[model samples]
Structures are given as C-alpha cells and as structure tokens.
Target: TKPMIQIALDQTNLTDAVAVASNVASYVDVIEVGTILAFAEGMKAVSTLRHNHPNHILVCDMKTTDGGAILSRMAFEAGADWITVSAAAHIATIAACKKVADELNGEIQIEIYGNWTMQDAKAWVDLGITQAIYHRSRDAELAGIGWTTDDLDKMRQLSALGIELSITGGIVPEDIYLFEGIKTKTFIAGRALAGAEGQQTAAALREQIDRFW
Candidate 1:
C-alpha cells in the first residue's frame, strides 16, 4: 500500500486547522492534532477534528511524559485513533500507554526526542511500540543542519527492524522522493502544505504527493 499522508495542524486556532482540513482532508489519510493545538485547546482539538471528519484517522500528539495510561485513555476516549508518547518516558509509562492502547483498540506512537538514540527506539519497539517518529531537532534546524544521509541510514536501519516509521520535520512535496524506498508508513507535512500560498495549495500538495505513488 502507499504510505499514508498525515497533515499536521500545528496552529493555535481551530479555524486555521479547519481551513487546512477542509482543503486536504480528501487527499490525506490522517489528521494530526499537533502538540501546540492540543495544548491550546486540550481535547477540543481532537474532538472537533473527529466531529468534522469522522472518517479520517485522528492522531493526537499528546507528547505525554507521565500518567500515560490516563492520558492515552483520555485521548482515545476523546476520539483519537492514535496517541503519541515520548520515547523518553519511563518504560513503565510507555507500557501504561501501550496497555491503554490495547484496551482501546488505538495505536501508540513513540516519538524520539533529545538525547534518545536508535537503541532507545529498539527498546521501545521491543516493549510493544508499533510506531516511531524520526525527525530533525529544532536545535539542529536553528544550527542550519539539513537532512543527511546519516538520517536516511538510521531510517533504513529502523525499517530493517520491522518498526513502522513516520517521518516529520519540514517535509515537503519534493522531499517525498527521499523516502521512496525507506519503508515509511506515514509522511507528515506541516508548513509545506499549511503555509503554502494560494487557495489551491492543498490540491497542489496532493498532486505532488500522488506523483510519488
């Protein structure tokens, strides 16, 4: 199957999210309630997105550090198909989230943040993590570091381990080719589509994404 495209609505306002959603909902497979949006509107972001697009998979980027069970349960109950927990979280916390996910029939996506390594990712997968996010750090971006072959190698290694990979961080239409054979299950794009010019940006992005298939 083709890799799913997930649009990240990282904005603060629901209207902005809705505008993007309305335009790209048909082209995208999932709608992500970004950390910024979740923080600003709490579960309202997930709830509203679920209400607006009942058929699309809704992913809530909670970035939970503790109380994973409660938070994961709450997000699933609030209508999320997937919830993210920090890979930096305690193993028990991650297990808690995974437990809730199993019960709720939702999926747990572990995001690797600062200081975490591929060893940590392997550990998470061993602990029942089904999804992993690979991305460049904000600090690296501020330091003008671009995607390197090293990142691709890491992604290839992770794919070899049988983990479902989802990549983020400044992904654009042209960059999709970079992931052509990387075994990525999802490709997340934010500013590339959401911040594009003109009313047809979403359609344009969808067209570019289709080219990869």
Candidate 2:
C-alpha cells in the first residue's frame, strides 16, 4: 500500500499549528499533534483539528512514559484516533493504554524510542498492538546525522516482524523514495512540510508516494 503522509504539527502555538494544517490539509492523510504541540496546547489541539479536519486521522503524540492509560484516554476522549507511547515504557503501561484504545475503538502506536528490541516489539504484537513509528531522532538529525542504510535495515527487520511502520524525523519529499519496497504505513514530515513552502512540499511528497507505490 502507498504510505500515508502525516504532517506533524510541532508548532508551539495553536494558531500556527492550525494555519499550517489548513494549508496542507488537502494533501495529507494524517495529522500528528506533536509532542511539543500537545504539551503546549493540551487536548485543545487534538479536538480543534478533530472539529476542522473530520476526514483525517489524528494522532496525539503523547510519548507517554508512564500513566499511559490516563494520557491515552485523555487524547482519545479529546478526539484523537490514536495516541503514542514510548517503546521504553513497561509492557504493563503499553497494555494499559491499549486497553483504553480498545475500549474507545482507537489505537496505540509504540514510538520506537530508546533501546527497544525485537523482544519488546514481539511483546507488543502479543498484546495485539501493531502500529509503530520508527523515528530518526530530531536531536541526531540536528547534530548532522542523516538516515542511513542501518536505519533502512532496521525498518526492514521491523517490517518482517509484521509491524506497521511510520517513518519520521527530518523527512523530506526527496527522502521518501529511500524506503521503496519496504512496507511503510505512514511518512511523517515536520520541518519539511511546514512554513511558507508547506503546501508545495506536501503536494510533492504526496506525488512521490503515488509514484513510488
């Protein structure tokens, strides 16, 4: 399947977030209420997008390390279709969030952070949780590290594990082809699809996916 384009609304203010989202709403398939944005605007961000973009799937990037149940419930209740939890969190915590997601007909994504292993992913699969976001850390990218063959290799391995994958961290329209033939559920773009150039970049990214898949 073609990878869904997810625009990360990482802006610190609701106005900027909403404006950016509005600019690219027709081009993207998912809206991520980014960790920083969620922290800054709380559930208001998710609900506002919910009200405005009724057709797009919403992900609340909570990155919850603990109290997963509560945080995920809050996001789901506030109109998120999905919520993210840290892969480093305890299985119990992930399970708790999944339970809430199940009850609400929502979903939980395990953000591949820290030292998560195959065992951890398998455990998540055991718990019936399959969605995952493989991040190329923003800090690492800021330090000049770009996505490597090693990253693609890991994504391949995760794909083999039957994990539905979303790629993020400094993703650009040109970089979308690097994962060709690998099963990617979504491609999350932040800086690449924000600012004055957002709409064109989004159209290009969406076009790239259409061509690739």
Candidate 3:
C-alpha cells in the first residue's frame, strides 16, 4: 500500500483545527485528534471531524495510561479508527487496549517515546501491534535539535521490518528531504500545515510530500 499522511491538529481550540482541516483534509489520509485538542475539547474534536469528513481515518491520540480497555473502547465508539497509548504504560495496559481493539476491529498505535529500545518495539510487535510512532524528542526539538541521520536510519530500519512507522515531531517542509530514502507510512505534522500561510497549505504540503514518494 502507498504511504499515508496524517495531520496532527494539536491546536487548543476546535476552530483552529477545523480551519486547518478544511484546507488539508483532502490531501491527508488521516486526521489525528492530538492529545492537546482531545484534552481541551474532549470528543467534540473527534465527532466534528467525523461529521465533516466521514471517510477520513480518524486517530484519537488518547495517550491512555490507565483503564486502557475502557478508553480505547470509548474512542472506537466515538468513531476513531485507531487509538494510541503510551508505551511506558504497563504491559497489562497495552494488552487491555489490544483486546478492546480486537473487539471493535480497530487498530492500536503505541507511541514509543523516550528510552524505549528496539527490544521494546519488538515486544509490542509481538503483541500484535502493527503500528509504532518514532518521534523526535519534544524537549530536544524545543531546544532546536534538528533531525539526525541516525533518526532517519532508524526509521528506515523499522520500515524494513514491515511495521508501519509514523514519524512525528517538528516536521517542516524543509525537513521533508531528511526522509528521502525513508518509506514512512505516515508523516504527522502539526504547525507545518496548521501554521502555514493561506488556505492552500494542505495542497502545498501534499505537493511537497509527493516529491518524497
């Protein structure tokens, strides 16, 4: 299958998210209810996007830590095609979410942030998780850390394993080249698309992304 693009609407309000969604939803394959938006606006973010773009694959960044089964079930019920959980959560938590996903016929994406090793990733893959997120450290990005070749190489290696990899954190148009040889299934962008100029940022982003493919 061809790679997919996921827009991360991490804004604090539904208005800003909708504005960006209206511009880029056509080009993107998935709409992520970012953690910030989910917390601030609750399921309204998921419901509105579902109402407006029913065909779009909606991912709820539930970041579920505890009560994984209940949370994942709620997100699936609310129209999320996939729900995310922190890798740091207990194995029981991960298992719970996986069970719920199995019941709902949904997928679970475990965000592998921080000191998680390949061993950890392999374990999740063993647990039947086909998706994993490899993100730039938020603190490092805030400190102006740029994408390293090592990160790209790691993503390449992960992709080779047939695990659908989604790259996130500080993705910009200029940095798109860094992903040149990387066949990332999903590129999660926040400010790059949402904060871009004019109503055509989505089209512009889609154009730039096509070059990488």
Residue-by-residue lDDT tens digits, candidate 1, 1-213: 456778888889888787777776766788899999998888977888899999999999988999998999989999999999987898899999999898998999988776877787777888777688888657667878777777778888888877788888877666677766676768787755554452255555456657665
Number of the top candidate by lDDT?
A: 2
131-191: candidate 2 lDDT, tens digit per residue: 8999885666787878877788988888888888898877887888888877788998885
How much RMSD separates candidate 2 from the native structure?
1.8
Against the reference, the lDDT scores of all candidates come to: 0.81, 0.87, 0.79
Model 3 lDDT per residue over 24-75, tens place: 7766788899999999899888888878888889999977878997899888
Q: Clashing pairs in model 2?
A: none
Candidate 2 wrong stretches, greater than 4 Å: 137-145
- Two-way lDDT contest, 1 vs 3, winner: 1
State every prediction's TM-score relative to the real structure: 0.87, 0.92, 0.85
> CA lDDT of 93 in candidate 2?
98
| Model 3 TM-score (2 dp) | 0.85
